[PDB]
Amino acid sequence: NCNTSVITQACPKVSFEPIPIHYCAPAGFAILKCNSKTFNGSGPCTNVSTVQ
Amino acid sequence: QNITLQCRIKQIINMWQGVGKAMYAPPIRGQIRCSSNITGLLLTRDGGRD
Amino acid sequence: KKVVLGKKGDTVELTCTASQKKSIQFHWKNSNQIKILGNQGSFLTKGPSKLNDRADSRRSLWDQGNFPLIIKNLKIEDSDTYICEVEDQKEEVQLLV
Amino acid sequence: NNNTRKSIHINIRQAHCNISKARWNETLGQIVAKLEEQ
Amino acid sequence: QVQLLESGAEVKKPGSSVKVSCKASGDTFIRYSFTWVRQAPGQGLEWMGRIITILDVAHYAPHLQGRVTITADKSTSTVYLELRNLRSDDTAVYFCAGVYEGEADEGEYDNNGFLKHWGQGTLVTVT
Amino acid sequence: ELELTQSPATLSVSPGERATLSCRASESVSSDLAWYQQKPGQAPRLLIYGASTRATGVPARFSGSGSGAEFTLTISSLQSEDFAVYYCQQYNNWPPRYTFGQGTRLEIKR
Ligand SMILES: *[C@@H]1O[C@H](CO)[C@@H](O[C@@H]2O[C@H](CO)[C@@H](O[C@@H]3O[C@H](CO[C@H]4O[C@H](CO)[C@@H](O)[C@H](O)[C@@H]4O)[C@@H](O)[C@H](O[C@H]4O[C@H](CO)[C@@H](O)[C@H](O)[C@@H]4O[C@H]4O[C@H](CO)[C@@H](O)[C@H](O)[C@@H]4O[C@H]4O[C@H](CO)[C@@H](O)[C@H](O)[C@@H]4O)[C@@H]3O)[C@H](O)[C@H]2NC(C)=O)[C@H](O)[C@H]1NC(C)=O
Ligand SMILES: *[C@@H]1O[C@H](CO)[C@@H](O[C@@H]2O[C@H](CO)[C@@H](O[C@@H]3O[C@H](CO)[C@@H](O)[C@H](O)[C@@H]3O)[C@H](O)[C@H]2NC(C)=O)[C@H](O)[C@H]1NC(C)=O
Ligand SMILES: *[C@@H]1O[C@H](CO)[C@@H](O[C@@H]2O[C@H](CO)[C@@H](O[C@@H]3O[C@H](CO)[C@@H](O)[C@H](O)[C@@H]3O)[C@H](O)[C@H]2NC(C)=O)[C@H](O)[C@H]1NC(C)=O
Ligand SMILES: *[C@@H]1O[C@H](CO)[C@@H](O[C@@H]2O[C@H](CO)[C@@H](O)[C@H](O)[C@H]2NC(C)=O)[C@H](O)[C@H]1NC(C)=O
Ligand SMILES: *[C@@H]1O[C@H](CO)[C@@H](O[C@@H]2O[C@H](CO)[C@@H](O)[C@H](O)[C@H]2NC(C)=O)[C@H](O)[C@H]1NC(C)=O
Ligand SMILES: *[C@@H]1O[C@H](CO)[C@@H](O[C@@H]2O[C@H](CO)[C@@H](O)[C@H](O)[C@H]2NC(C)=O)[C@H](O)[C@H]1NC(C)=O
Ligand SMILES: *[C@@H]1O[C@H](CO)[C@@H](O[C@@H]2O[C@H](CO)[C@@H](O)[C@H](O)[C@H]2NC(C)=O)[C@H](O)[C@H]1NC(C)=O
């Protein structure tokens, strides 16, 4: 037995323009970055650097 | 020398965040500009025994 | 192989199952590996097959791990083996119209 | 603006996008060249 | 674009239910929204509620929802106004009205409330 | 929700006179106030779509405007066929809480 849930909400217009967001590691963690050119998404990188 | 795409602005859309639909209010009055950079494409391959 | 029966002019529902109920990506393919249907995010995509204008799916059940292929207006020509691609799982069903 | 029609019979939703033709065909030529490697 | 055809008059003992129908013709029902108006004698145009046929949703005047529901039967292009627990207070002439919405099927629905297409008016009373 | 009221209860005019009808909105409705014409035994047919667009089929005699708490409807060269009750309707509600005013009746001066 399936049914739906409907919510009626106010409909204001807002300005909408995506801002770059950076992710940063929590204490105890680090991010390894693959610096190989043309990495292709999987497998080994032979040039690895560490960033927060 | 300009490829022009025809576009429409819609109010009833499907949601990318989950199964369901949502209705949005009618469009704002005018001069709406969206200048942007194409930085990549998402393609799928149509193969098969044929 | 599962076998499902029907006749010309009928509608049949063939299914794939994901026990985790997470509305995961899945695909349906015919015996020639032609994509019929699939889940892109929350959207239903119809592939370039003979069922392109007849295949459907109940999106509301994707949350239950139920990913049906619904073929409307069956013809004898539709009696193929349909393949589920769910994660690693490869269920196969023969439809006999 | 100057797109104020609301109905055809009983245009506010009409919009369009421009792509430089020469950039797009060049872009695809490079993509195609890479697809050909596979 | 369309004409709306309504059911006839009815009388019920208070507490009974009454269902009023409004059939649309000349366009696709799904394409646009319908509303109901209650012309009680001596009164103005009390709003009953609104139903959207592209999305099966409805809204009701805030004092009436305990008694009234609206159903859009897409297969018969007919909207039904159901009055539960009918009171003598609800004696009125009821009618539907339609509002054209653009290409609702394509998701270009306007959500207009301006009433252009009207029904005839059916008196509902109690006994 | 928003209450709409008519200024005159009725307005007595002569044919050929310009009718001047008005409606007040207690919650400052914005360009969401429509006008309707109801004749006895008839549906209250739309005259003005939104605050100022006459609906298709509406005679050029009918026009109006307004904003916020106050809106008007006028009928140039009023004809005998226009002695109807005019209604004020508001749409600035979401969730919908649409309302109508009481209706202003034109009277034929006699
Ligand atoms: C990829 O990245 C690119 C950028 O690198 C992204 O591109 C950006 O996309 C944005 C999409 O919104 C676009 O934003 C618009 O810019 C317009 C122009 O900005 C210039 O003027 C303002 C004035 O203060 C300056 O601050 C600014 O620095 C620039 O100089 C703005 O005008 C737009 O705002 C208006 O529309 C939004 C709609 O949500 C409203 O919320 C907002 O309040 C504004 O509304 C006015 O205009 C509407 C038009 O119908 C009126 O209805 C409304 O009442 C307001 O109108 C009054 O004010 C105007 C002001 O001139 C007046 O003329 C009118 O008569 C009224 O008084 C909005 O800000 C970015 O500019 C754009 N960037 C670039 C560089 O192009 C891109 O999208 C990214 N890709 C993706 C996919 O996201
Ligand atoms: C492995 O990946 C790293 C990360 O990209 C490569 O190092 C980077 O090399 C470039 C070019 O030599 C450096 O750019 C230069 O930086 C100086 C900084 O002031 C700037 O003045 C120059 O104009 C130029 O931008 C880059 O900084 C450097 N990055 C780091 C983190 O050191 C590295 O060469 C790669 N190794 C191999 C074997 O490919
Ligand atoms: C492809 O599309 C682009 C983007 O619309 C076209 O460029 C645009 O060409 C018009 C031609 O009049 C430019 O308008 C002029 O702008 C100057 C700026 O001050 C103004 O002074 C003039 O009176 C006039 O308005 C427009 O600005 C220009 N757009 C940009 C971003 O530069 C381009 O021509 C199109 N190509 C083809 C082949 O049609
Ligand atoms: C590019 O992607 C391919 C796979 O899509 C990676 O291929 C692997 O290469 C290593 C090299 O010894 C093999 O051992 C693996 O078996 C390969 N994977 C597969 C699936 O065959 C390739 O290394 C990638 N290029 C990179 C990371 O630079
Ligand atoms: C689209 O690509 C162009 C070209 O790379 C970007 O414009 C450049 O952005 C860098 C950022 O520091 C500036 O230094 C250059 O001067 C910009 N070039 C020009 C011609 O202005 C542009 O910002 C990109 N747009 C988006 C949305 O990313
Ligand atoms: C998109 O490109 C088209 C290319 O035709 C632009 O339309 C032309 O604009 C020029 C400007 O002087 C006119 O002279 C041409 O006659 C227009 N062509 C046509 C077929 O109308 C269009 O304006 C561009 N749009 C945007 C958003 O930049
Ligand atoms: C999209 O708009 C941008 C500007 O917002 C166009 O780029 C400009 O084109 C003019 C043409 O005379 C150049 O003078 C500017 O220097 C260009 N600006 C930048 C940042 O490069 C761009 O060509 C437009 N794209 C299309 C497809 O019309």
UniProtKB/TrEMBL annotation, chain D:
The 17 amino acids long immunosuppressive region is present in many retroviral envelope proteins. Synthetic peptides derived from this relatively conserved sequence inhibit immune function in vitro and in vivo. The membrane proximal external region (MPER) present in gp41 is a tryptophan-rich region recognized by the antibodies 2F5, Z13, and 4E10. MPER seems to play a role in fusion. It comes from Human immunodeficiency virus type 1 (HIV-1). The mature envelope protein (Env) consists of a homotrimer of non-covalently associated gp120-gp41 heterodimers. The resulting complex protrudes from the virus surface as a spike. There seems to be as few as 10 spikes on the average virion. Interacts with host CD4, CCR5 and CXCR4. Gp120 also interacts with the C-type lectins CD209/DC-SIGN and CLEC4M/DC-SIGNR (collectively referred to as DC-SIGN(R)). Gp120 and gp41 interact with GalCer. HIV-1 lineages are divided in three main groups, M (for Major), O (for Outlier), and N (for New, or Non-M, Non-O). The vast majority of strains found worldwide belong to the group M. Group O seems to be endemic to and largely confined to Cameroon and neighboring countries in West Central Africa, where these viruses represent a small minority of HIV-1 strains. The group N is represented by a limited number of isolates from Cameroonian persons. The group M is further subdivided in 9 clades or subtypes (A to D, F to H, J and K). Inhibitors targeting HIV-1 viral envelope proteins are used as antiretroviral drugs. Attachment of virions to the cell surface via non-specific interactions and CD4 binding can be blocked by inhibitors that include cyanovirin-N, cyclotriazadisulfonamide analogs, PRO 2000, TNX 355 and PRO 542. In addition, BMS 806 can block CD4-induced conformational changes. Env interactions with the coreceptor molecules can be targeted by CCR5 antagonists including SCH-D, maraviroc (UK 427857) and aplaviroc (GW 873140), and the CXCR4 antagonist AMD 070. It comes from the Viruses. Belongs to the HIV-1 env protein family. Transmembrane protein gp41: Acts as a class I viral fusion protein. Under the current model, the protein has at least 3 conformational states: pre-fusion native state, pre-hairpin intermediate state, and post-fusion hairpin state. During fusion of viral and target intracellular membranes, the coiled coil regions (heptad repeats) assume a trimer-of-hairpins structure, positioning the fusion peptide in close proximity to the C-terminal region of the ectodomain. The formation of this structure appears to drive apposition and subsequent fusion of viral and target cell membranes. Envelope glycoprotein gp160: Oligomerizes in the host endoplasmic reticulum into predominantly trimers. In a second time, gp160 transits in the host Golgi, where glycosylation is completed. The precursor is then proteolytically cleaved in the trans-Golgi and thereby activated by cellular furin or furin-like proteases to produce gp120 and gp41. The gene is env. This is Envelope glycoprotein gp160. Highly glycosylated by host. The high number of glycan on the protein is reffered to as 'glycan shield' because it contributes to hide protein sequence from adaptive immune system. It is found in: Host cell membrane; Host endosome membrane; Virion membrane.
